[PDB]
Amino acid sequence: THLERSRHQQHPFHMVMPSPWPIVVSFALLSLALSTALTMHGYIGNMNMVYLALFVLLTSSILWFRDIVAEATYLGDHTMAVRKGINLGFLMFVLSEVLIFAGLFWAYFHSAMSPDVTLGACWPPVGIEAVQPTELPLLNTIILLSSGATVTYSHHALIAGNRNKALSGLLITFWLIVIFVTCQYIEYTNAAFTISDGVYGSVFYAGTGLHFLHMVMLAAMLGVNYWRMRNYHLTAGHHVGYETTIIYTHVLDVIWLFLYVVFYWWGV
Amino acid sequence: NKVIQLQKIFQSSTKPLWWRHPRSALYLYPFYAIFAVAVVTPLLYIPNAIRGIKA
Amino acid sequence: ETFEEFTARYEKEFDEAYDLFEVQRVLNNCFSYDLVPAPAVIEKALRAARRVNDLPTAIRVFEALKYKVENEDQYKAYLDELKDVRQELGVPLKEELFP
Amino acid sequence: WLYSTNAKDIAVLYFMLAIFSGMAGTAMSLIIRLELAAPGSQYLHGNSQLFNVLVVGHAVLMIFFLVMPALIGGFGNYLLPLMIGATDTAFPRINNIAFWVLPMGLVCLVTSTLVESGAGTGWTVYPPLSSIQAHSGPSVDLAIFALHLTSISSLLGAINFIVTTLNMRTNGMTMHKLPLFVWSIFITAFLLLLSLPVLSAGITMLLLDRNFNTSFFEVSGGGDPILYEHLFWFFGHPEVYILIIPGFGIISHVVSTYSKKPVFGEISMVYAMASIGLLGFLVWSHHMYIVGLDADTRAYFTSATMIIAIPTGIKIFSWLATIHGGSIRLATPMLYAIAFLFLFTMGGLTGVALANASLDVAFHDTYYVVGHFHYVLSMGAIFSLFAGYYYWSPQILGLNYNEKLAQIQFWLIFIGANVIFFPMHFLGINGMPRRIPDYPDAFAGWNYVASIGSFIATLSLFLFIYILYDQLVNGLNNKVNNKSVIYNKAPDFVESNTIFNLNTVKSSSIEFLLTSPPAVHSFNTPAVQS
Amino acid sequence: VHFKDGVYENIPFKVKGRKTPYALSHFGFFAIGFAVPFVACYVQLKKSGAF
Amino acid sequence: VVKTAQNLAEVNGPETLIGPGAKEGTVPTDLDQETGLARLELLGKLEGIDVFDTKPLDSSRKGTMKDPIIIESYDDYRYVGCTGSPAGSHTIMWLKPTVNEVARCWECGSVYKLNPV
Amino acid sequence: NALKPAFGPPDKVAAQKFKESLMATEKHAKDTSNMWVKISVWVALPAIALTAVNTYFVEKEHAEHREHLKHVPDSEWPRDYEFMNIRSKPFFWGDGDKTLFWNPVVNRHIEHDD
């Protein structure tokens, strides 16, 4: 027939209504960047406008995300190509966020590959004492190798159809990551060298610093992957809000292993 | 559980999609209160930041 | 490809012209090549204009022939060669018309 | 309307800002060149500050607020939906934040001058010059954030173009058959993705060394300022190969439209166009030959950045091959695209003279560099932006632009900006340094020659505003009289006039088969190709 | 703009039917963009002693 | 009264494209808690006929004016390409066969009609 | 009637390749997911069961090590180098705070003007 075909869309790609959260996030990125440069130089007195700028930005993301899940499970222009659009739009995105590490790995090969004169002739220098890889940093590698063996233990389990392994298998992975925040909170509270400890104090809390600033959003990504799977939002044949979480962690084994070999093993 | 229930409400709603949640009336007027202040007070201190008057 | 395969291909396509459009779109690419077309194929470029009852697309043949002849000496010997089939159809040239 | 997510109406907001930032980016260059008219500070009274503020205030409006949002935003958000066969972009909601952070990238920059200090750091914002002991106020704090808002708009503005080209084509549009303007930006989108996160660490580390005193770059602590010279310039040379690859897309469409002929070697033009993008990564310290690199490291780069002149010779000799046989219809996009083929290539010969490590040691930071990079920025990326506006203005706006008045705007740009940038090669071959408000008295010769020309080019730009006024008010009364040119392709020699109005547009792209202006839904059915 | 693909209705301007002449609102967008460095050359000279 | 479709044949409006609710204890099994137009593409993918076309136009024969090439249009102005009778033999040229006028393809010589449906 | 015959031909050849493979991938969602249960909860969780207690005991010898330095230095600090402590443009949320959270067991920073 053709009368219903003249009442529907004829191309698989999605058409979105005009949303105003585009200019809401833009106004937050102004009041983030403008206000974080004022309190460094006065003019306000208190450091809470940046705390305001981290609040209006992040609630603007979930209101952006509330309209997206209204399109994901409640309006649904997600065809095969549009499913391949985001799944390649995010797989090509993490090529950018793995290259920003090469903007921080290459500083570590700038102060240790050729020895400098302001420091000692050894890396790490005198006065600065590093943690051996046969200590609590080795717990940080095995707890992700166990994370890399439970994110795929629950990847196929959601497609498998049973909810005893699909629901409970993501709560044990979520608390495996909040416990990873606290063991990278030990070296932020018990290690000798600080952020202002010269060039070894600079890049060590940058290469491992940005690896800590991604778990705050990864655990926040599990914070909706358990809420949606309990509120029956995600499905077992079409899951984008669950697939972007696995590739957020399956590449994380590769970058942390490259982070562990030069910061700790080659870094002593 | 509410996925078919909300699908009756979201589809054929004749509303803006950011007003199409049933739990969305309280989500906006406090949000428009923190939006009406965070875009003027970083900018109202700019004539205070031109004369050297800092804090 | 060669000069002769050029002649046999475009003297064939002029026969199934059937319209004013498929004369001018085929007279175009019979003149928009690197080489110069033979008088064998241009005789079917005037018979194609007679089959469609349009005279200025037969006066525009001899003006496209004038610019793309590369020598006036190789044009008057080329003009007198076509005078056998240019006096039957009564096709003038643009300089004799003086428009 | 303000927050409509249609990709057509976003790209008209992109172009509405790239002239506002243009008439601010060239009013600063007016005062810059007015101060170099005579020795002694004439108009600036005695202030050598507000001259390293205006130079950075001008050089970043031209790069990041004119040529970036027009050749990628102003056109790529209008043509890559249209030529490929999409209805709009693949991610249309983030398509609106990629524009609306750009005025917020302006309030983060115009207020960076109005504050008490003024960021006198230059465009290459170097670490010990911009350190907190040197620059104290919040001036350079905002100048390293407006460079971050544009770094993040044009980053997600290129994720929007890899998952548009790779899946959202039509039926017969195979991967070997695309318009060259799409292969410009899709190749560019694999350089915008792989160079901007390098930059975003190279600026945030300078933020950390200014109010968090972490000493990535501070000398007291072993932090080099020479790490910045290879980490910013790792972004820097791909950045100037991003202002020219969409410039290589528009010229490949104009020069093969106003010549009634397909482009010479189209498959040869797409392989020598990613090879510019790929090999442009491997040459990033030719800017820093004198900074104390090794005698074999400079020996590699003096052989490696000459190989960028291998595929650019293919992409020029084929533009001298695609107009050899064919006709030439000298309208205004053909005038720009044929003076682009002479003034960009003279900005290429000065490229390979600067490319040597054995010859940059008598040319760095002189005015011979500014003579070289302005033949490939105001003559290679404005000559392809004027040849892209005039080529798609009445097709997109619907109104013709008084063609007899756009020819005098071409010549006042051609000879009224060659008079500025040609004597710069003479002041630099003697050794006049850059960014200076005053100079030795022997450099007052050509600096008055190059000062008479900046009123010529910026009188043509005042005329270009009037062309924009004649196009919007009585731009409908242009194609009904003999003011403009209507049909950009005149018919053939044996094509009769009464048969031309049946088969009018013999284009090779969808962009002209659409209506003028195109519809709000110009694709509501999947089109087919071959 | 969502609908009405007319002639002047893909631009957020108001070209025809304006109460005031359009050359006020067209040169007044491009000369204002020209006069922003001439107020950066004003409040930074008057602050720094010059005039 | 407004039931579901559960087959490619019946549509009869947009309110009949939803699926039925699934009980607690099991996941949605790709056919129950679906959405609509994603389910509409899936219901066509459930059968042996694609809802959308990824196939070029019939570029085998040339197409005269007495025997033209018919395209399966769905509106007035379906744009077509013309890359040859072997589909690779000449430069592309884009066309627009409108309502009861033909696109004539000056270079190749192919004639297209609309078939507006 | 006019102009509304049918959409297209229901050939049923494009079916039974995507539908039966959804059960074949379901098998690949079954036995491969059961391949990881013998190595996640049976290998990796006993691997951290011998590693966490290996680090539960070496944590306590360092938790007592910090109590020595925060108690007394017994002369003074060993006068740290010029790169270890830098205070150009001191911090803005407080007066001289090193970071968001820092204990004085490792971050004492006593000035030695002398």
Ligand code: HEA
């Ligand atoms: C996009 C790049 C771009 C462009 C177009 C220009 C254009 C111009 N620039 Fe600039 N310039 C730079 C980028 C650019 N410049 C950079 C990076 C520096 C170095 C800073 C640093 O490193 O210190 C620099 C530095 C620089 C100097 C200082 C030299 C030194 O210290 O290094 C001078 C002074 O003569 C100068 C002048 C000019 C002039 C007269 C123009 C004229 O071409 C402008 C007048 C001409 C026009 C009329 C055309 C442009 C106007 C438009 C609005 C565009 C049209 C487009 C649309 C409207 C569709 N420039």
Ligand code: HEA
């Ligand atoms: C925006 C466009 C652009 C483009 C396309 C180029 C292209 C090139 N640039 Fe340039 N360049 C800049 C913009 C650009 N540059 C800028 C903004 C700066 C820095 C200024 C600053 O720091 O402020 C700069 C700086 C810069 C330097 C640093 C000098 C210094 O600061 O000390 C050098 C030196 O190596 C250089 C070289 C080249 C070369 C070799 C090319 C080559 O790609 C060009 C090759 C092209 C051809 C040669 C012509 C066509 C080819 C032929 C006809 C055939 C082959 C040729 C022959 C066989 C001879 N550029």
Ligand SMILES: CCCCCCCCCCC(=O)OC[C@H](COP(=O)(O)OC[C@H](O)COP(=O)(O)OC[C@@H](COC(=O)CC)OC(=O)CCC)OC(=O)CCCCCCCC
């Ligand atoms: C911030 C924004 C500021 C913008 C300010 C920019 C100002 C630029 C203005 C340019 C302009 O408006 O010119 C277009 C206008 C209309 O032209 P048209 O395209 O309709 O075709 C006309 C017909 O085809 C031929 O016109 P004709 O040949 O019959 O007239 C002769 C004309 C030619 O001489 C000149 O152009 C220079 C003087 O001479 C005169 O008219 C002298 C009269 C005193 O042509 C004219 O009549 C121009 C008259 C002179 C205007 C002052 C010039 C100052 C340099």
Ligand SMILES: [Cu+2]
């Ligand atoms: Cu370069």
Ligand SMILES: [Zn+2]
């Ligand atoms: Zn054809």
